[PDB]
Swiss-Prot record:
Domain notes: The olfactomedin-like domain mediates NFASC/neurofascin and NRCAM binding.
Compartment(s) where it occurs, according to its Swiss-Prot or TrEMBL record: Cell membrane; Cell projection, Axon
Modification note: N-glycosylated.
Portion held of the full protein: 298 to 543 of 549
Sugar-bearing residue positions: 29, 57, 78, 164
Organism annotation: Rattus norvegicus (Rat)
UniProt domain Olfactomedin-like: residue ranges: 1-246
Protein purpose: Ligand for NRCAM and NFASC/neurofascin that plays a role in the formation and maintenance of the nodes of Ranvier on myelinated axons. Mediates interaction between Schwann cell microvilli and axons via its interactions with NRCAM and NFASC. Nodes of Ranvier contain clustered sodium channels that are crucial for the saltatory propagation of action potentials along myelinated axons. During development, nodes of Ranvier are formed by the fusion of two heminodes.
Coiled coil: none
Subunit structure: Homotrimer (via collagen-like domains). Interacts with NRCAM. Interacts with NFASC/neurofascin. Interaction with glial NRCAM enhances interaction with axonal NFASC. Interacts with MYOC.
Tissue specificity as recorded in UniProt: Detected in Schwann cells (at protein level).
Entry superkingdom: Eukaryota
Name of the protein described by the UniProt record: Gliomedin
Amino acid sequence: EPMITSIGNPAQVLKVKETFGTWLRESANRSDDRIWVTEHFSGIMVKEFEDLPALLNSSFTLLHLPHYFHGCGHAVYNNSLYYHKGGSNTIVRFEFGKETPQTLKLEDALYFDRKYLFANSKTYFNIAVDEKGLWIIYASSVDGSSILVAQLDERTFSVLRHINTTYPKSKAGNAFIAQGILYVTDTKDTRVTFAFDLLRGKQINANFGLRMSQSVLAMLSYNMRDQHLYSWEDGHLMLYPVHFSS
Ligand code: NA
């Protein structure tokens, strides 16, 4: 059971003007160099870059999505974009290059009226993929607070388990998932201060630094392919190395 015990210094890949956005790469065992970007809290377009030099030179192809996205909690896995359909409790899986979009409903989830999972990034849902599964982090519309995690079946894009962490969303700045462990940041998004073992269904101790900057953190996402954290911090696109104890 490998645990993160510290985070290394960030490497900045690009500075853009936009406060909020995402930048994402493939994590499946698919040596794909493409980068996908969204800008702002909502929209219908994704920018596809062929590789990092393309991103550095603002050379993209615009992809029109079948449904508007909201927030900065998306993920790419197996040539597909997973994202929150704005104004609904629907999550979309949009497969690139063929458009076979699938959807699923999270009936018990907050999704509008600024009752955010992560207020700092105006995000209601955070899709995350890692070594142990495909996950969706969200907050309960039953109590308006508790952070829940759905574990998905990849083939059918359906929810197998709902996992209640019992952690209040008011205490969470953002989060990521690595080796089956949910790591949650403080409200200032400077330290990881809470963790939860998603397979054993139990809290586990975690307290370590993420970063020194308190600039607005829009996106925080683990990639199992290179074991780095990807972030968007007030227009600064960063990569952090991660240190596992095992
Ligand atoms: Na996140």
